[model samples]
Target: SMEQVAMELRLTELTRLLRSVLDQLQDKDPARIFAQPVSLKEVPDYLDHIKHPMDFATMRKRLEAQGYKNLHEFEEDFDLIIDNCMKYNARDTVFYRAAVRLRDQGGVVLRQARREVDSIG
Candidate 1:
């Protein structure tokens, strides 16, 4: 009975958890590399190598529009954010190293949120 609102009410519930994950990623990315979109002017070959870029700004816009279907999708987008960085930047560069760290550390924060969310709903 109460679960009938699952479809409509999920966005409200997931947004709170999504916010936590996004904020932590922003904290990790102090240089703002992942926060902003990559431009062709800045890196001419960026589009040549990477398809399906994800960024904090884009994620937030999606959140405001309630675009996430579930926590899994939220986590998937975050992985895309990191994956794009690793794919675009060489391992020797700052961007790649940062993405590696985010993947390792952010996994902790993200999985914890998943655990908490899973137990109740």
Candidate 2:
């Protein structure tokens, strides 16, 4: 169905963005706690277990074909997903909000780091 496909795309996109941001920090910083990095494959399962199953994908292929092309695009989709979660769910909206925050927080940290780097120049 179109709705499932759309949900899957959004979930995959958000998961990819969050993981990408984390990968950058994880590489540059020392002493990370998570032994295993976040997995995009687990996203759909987790959502499904919660009865909120959303988003669908083989990560790389889908990302190249449907993922956000820029930060702005990512942010827009992130916002839309959160908004939809609020409208669609009667409870546990915080779940979705936190998911968005988790990603946005990474972006915030990245932006700050970029500024610092620029300042050092």
Candidate 3:
């Protein structure tokens, strides 16, 4: 059962790191557009263009509900948020530029988190 203790620590650190990445994405998004689901009423074409839409609010729910099985799963959903943006908006648009700026400012934390707990593992 010695490994049980190590497994617990890994889970705690992984949960904390996933939360941090979600927070950063929400905080950095301009006008908080990606913080919640896109309004189908406001942008009806959104559904037509992007089927796998994602948002910070949904990510938060999943995080809290323990829906994520691993760090890679969390990262996949995280990338989906940005990927949806790029596909739905032109690079010339503010929404698109906001994602660019956010991505540019930091690809650091999640990566650092990976390295940290990876060694711990």
Candidate 4:
């Protein structure tokens, strides 16, 4: 159906947009950045710096931390967040919300990379 095609198209564009942003966020030091998760206290600061905020309360610290082992993991989670947000019937309502999810999750990935460097050094 045409409607389904449009939905799929929008999702593709959203995924592409996120991937571009993720590419931009590639840290100068990939080793440390992809090594570990950000410290708990720094989580808020990381969230504050991003264009959007995430509901970290819903996440399990251990699992979230583990995901930092690979930057690809973070990207996958970002996709999941955007995927969930788009479930809403109204596209307009979900657009900003989905972007926020990406920003917040992206922050976590970047922050983890910085923290990883500190931990290694």
Candidate 5:
């Protein structure tokens, strides 16, 4: 069955994903920044800074503030994929953990930005 295979493959991919995240952390000196989970609420910050996707809460708020009544108002110009594996579809669990990679890279960029600003002073 497709579900069974997806389950097994996801399990295997999740294991590998976990090890990769661990390996990334191990390589870091840990004195500056560390890896963490990506909250749906924080997506807007990334979008603002890096032009990535907006978080659900921010998206809704932005729409309402602009007097847009529904989400579909932005459908022509934006994406809204929730990467909802953390909430359902356990067979694709690797995607849930995979978001941590984005967080890790974002943290690195944040740290670099901080250093650059600090150096100017």
Candidate 6:
């Protein structure tokens, strides 16, 4: 349960950072889409719109807690679970490079707009 608690707190921290970044990235210019007028009240609803893959790190920690020690051991156990689960019987899966990417295209657009605004005056 401790690990679950820690994971939830970690997710919350990530959410906080996401919000801070979005707020700055949403500054006015009349064409922002997908992200609009976000508020703390919308955190839950907004997050639901973005689906993330299963939490592999949490699963790995759980495996380690139970005695699995190496990547090979973890991979074997993971394969066993999927091999038995009918849904994955015909599919293939592996632990590969996972990453997160965050970008602020808004800032670039805004900078260009500011330049145009200055030129017109």
Best by TM-score: 1
Could you report the Cα RMSD, in angstroms, for every candidate shown? 2.1, 12.3, 2.4, 17.0, 19.2, 18.9
Scanning candidate 3 in windows of ten residues, the lowest lDDT window is 101-110
- Assess each prediction's global lDDT (C-alpha) against the native: 0.83, 0.45, 0.79, 0.44, 0.39, 0.35
Candidate 2 lDDT over 2-90, as tens digits, reads 99997786666555654565455434323222223234485444444333222212223334565554445544543443444454444
Clashes in predicted model 4: 1
C-alpha lDDT of residue 72 in model 4: 52
- Candidate 4 regions off by >4 Å? 1-55, 63-67, 94-121
Ranking by TM-score: 1, 3, 2, 4, 6, 5
Tens-place lDDT digits, model 1, residues 19-40: 8778987798787778878877
Model 5: per-residue lDDT, tens digit, 44-120?
35434333433334433444344332223433222222233233324355554443443455356435443533463
Scored against the true structure, residue 63 in model 6 reaches a CA lDDT of: 39
Error at 2, model 3, angstroms: 10
Candidate 6 residue lDDT tens string, 1-121:
9999876665554444333333444342123322222233845463354232122333444433444322344334333322232232222422111010112344454354445434642
Candidate 1 clash figure, as a count:
0
Candidate 4's TM-score reads 0.31
lDDT of 3 by residue, 9-108 (tens): 6776777777876777667775886788898998887888998889889999988776776878987887888889988889899889877776665477
User: Which candidate has the highest lDDT of all?
Assistant: 1
lDDT, model 5: 0.39
In model 6, the clashing pairs are: none
| Per-candidate TM-score against the hidden true structure | 0.88, 0.33, 0.83, 0.31, 0.26, 0.28
Error of 6 at 83 (Å): 38
